[PDB]
Design a protein around this ligand. Structure first.
Ligand SMILES: C[C@H]1[C@H](O)CN1c1nc(N2C[C@@H]3[C@@H](CO)[C@@H]3C2)cc(C(F)(F)F)c1C#N
Ligand SMILES: C[C@H]1[C@H](O)CN1c1nc(N2C[C@@H]3[C@@H](CO)[C@@H]3C2)cc(C(F)(F)F)c1C#N
Lengths: 296, 301
């Protein structure tokens, strides 16, 4: 019961730092370039390791030079990679990220290689005893529901102090993913998902979606520079203002920084209010830096 | 390994990793869109000409700057996949190996480019001075860092001065960017290639106008070459006779990226084989035309 497991994507982010966002049909020169290990669950693993949490990553990779870069980067961070679902078909996903140096805006052109996703059969072969917390990035919902049903079955057979805490992230406005609201002790819903469901604020989103979560769950919604809100079974709306840096330089992975920090703070026994504040604090600190170094 | 004396064609210039993404619509700032296709391609003028030389059956070598890393590894493996000798690469301790990002809009064919950064130092005259020239029969220089490249050209001239006419290294220069610093390179090389883009920026409306207007800038005996895309290419040598070749357009145009480099490599290859300027022009247009109907460089020969 020592590690935090993150199930989701690992993507090579090919980043270009620009003075201004390029206009269509133009040729602009970038200021600088870097390769960064990306993906939601993968970025959250980076943040958890930097916060001092033992953590593991579970996701699909294909053998090759890009996987080697990613594996060496995970290993450099102290991220346990023993649970990686190695594939025999498809390439590892990669993406072109354009980071605007004047405001930190990040634009992503993702290349989805259509690598097979982590399955419920892959998850069944995992020894759950070493994990205190399991975070699932919503992707292949029907297959992930079976993974969540397996964690529930395990917890059923465990004393309350040995129960694995669960968090779920619904970040894409995909109908298939909305069944994941009913799973996990902590549900993270993105601003994009909230707006696509017609909600104009985090408070509207939380009140409008709480009926979809399981009994006792906490629903969390970060609204970028407007801060973040949480709603638990007591019906009390919790809010944290954002911690914007004076100069926002790189927002790529800000949401993942927030998720990992909320998870970390809750796993340390801190209140939902404290975890919300800590999440914004670390997300804000990150927005003032290129990448994840120096967040702690 | 052992490279036989006077056997290789060297190309000095840029190598870049081109990340090309095809999108249904241009992305709005701060958005996450999925592309239809994404390909990593080795680019750069000297680099593309190297690919074409290898496919034409010429032993060839690339000289350009790279920094150790994963971008360089991909580029090195791509050069090797194309049979390009990479022993002359100027490995750098500072800067990034060039990487560019091209977004192609599938709904209108628009190309948006986020060009590589300028952190990597170019091949210097000091780097070039440490190169034993005996293994090269032809040295082609892609005009970049002009003042440094002039010293490289002056070194090749010094070498040729003490060689019998059959062991003299032939030289070609490409002026492809409309940058003033590059225009001093017109005075170097047995063969000078001037792009349509450079010609138009100097106010020339055709290859004939460009060749007649710029011939005064080349060294005694040099041949000035100007390809004008689907209008074909022209050459002008010391005899004052304008030479022309019509283009050889493919039945369906698929990919024109690297067509100019294909033409340069083919002209160089044909001249290195002892063929006339007229024959080399025609061969250059034939290979450039064949390439335009193909995706990439496979199947050009
Ligand atoms: C997670 C949320 C939490 O609600 C505070 N925090 C911030 N999110 C920001 N986002 C989110 C989205 C990225 C893309 O992944 C864009 C920008 C920006 C800032 C900041 F104000 F620093 F600019 C902050 C903060 N603090
Ligand atoms: C090198 C020149 C030479 O003058 C014949 N050759 C061609 N160049 C073409 N270009 C070049 C430029 C790309 C942009 O990267 C546009 C298109 C097109 C054709 C073709 F007729 F096939 F379409 C041909 C030929 N042959």
């Amino acid at each position: 019961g020592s590690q935090i497991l993150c199930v989701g994507l690992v993507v090579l982010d090919v980043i270009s730092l620009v003075d201004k966002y390029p206009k269509e049909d133009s040729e602009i020169r970038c200021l600088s370039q870097r390769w960064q290990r990306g993906g939601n669950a993968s970025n959250s693993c980076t943040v958890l390791s930097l916060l001092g949490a033992p953590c593991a990553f579970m996701g699909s990779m294909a053998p090759g030079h890009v996987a080697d870069f990613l594996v060496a980067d995970f290993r450099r961070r102290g991220v346990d990679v023993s649970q990686v679902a190695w594939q025999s078909k498809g390439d590892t996903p990669s993406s072109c990220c354009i980071i605007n140096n004047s405001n930190g805006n990040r634009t992503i052109v993702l290349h989805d290689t259509s690598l097979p996703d982590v399955s419920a059969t892959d998850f069944e072969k995992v020894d759950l005893t070493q994990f205190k917390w399991i975070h699932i990035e919503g992707r292949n919902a029907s297959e992930q529901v079976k993974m969540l049903q397996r964690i529930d079955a395990h917890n059923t057979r465990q004393p309350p102090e040995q129960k694995i805490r669960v968090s779920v992230e619904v970040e894409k406005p995909r109908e298939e993913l909305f069944q994941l609201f009913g799973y996990g002790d902590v549900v993270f819903v993105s601003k994009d998902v909230a707006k696509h469901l017609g909600f104009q604020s985090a408070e509207e989103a939380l009140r409008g979606l709480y009926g979809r979560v399981r009994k006792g769950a906490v629903l969390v919604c970060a609204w970028a520079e407007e801060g973040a809100d949480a709603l638990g079974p007591d019906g009390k709306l919790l809010h944290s203002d954002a911690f914007p840096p004076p100069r926002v330089v790189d927002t790529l992975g800000a949401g993942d920084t927030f998720n990992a920090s909320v998870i970390f703070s809750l796993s340390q026994g801190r209140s939902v209010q404290e975890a919300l504040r800590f999440g914004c604090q670390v997300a804000g600190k990150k927005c003032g830096l290129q990448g994840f170094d120096g967040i702690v």
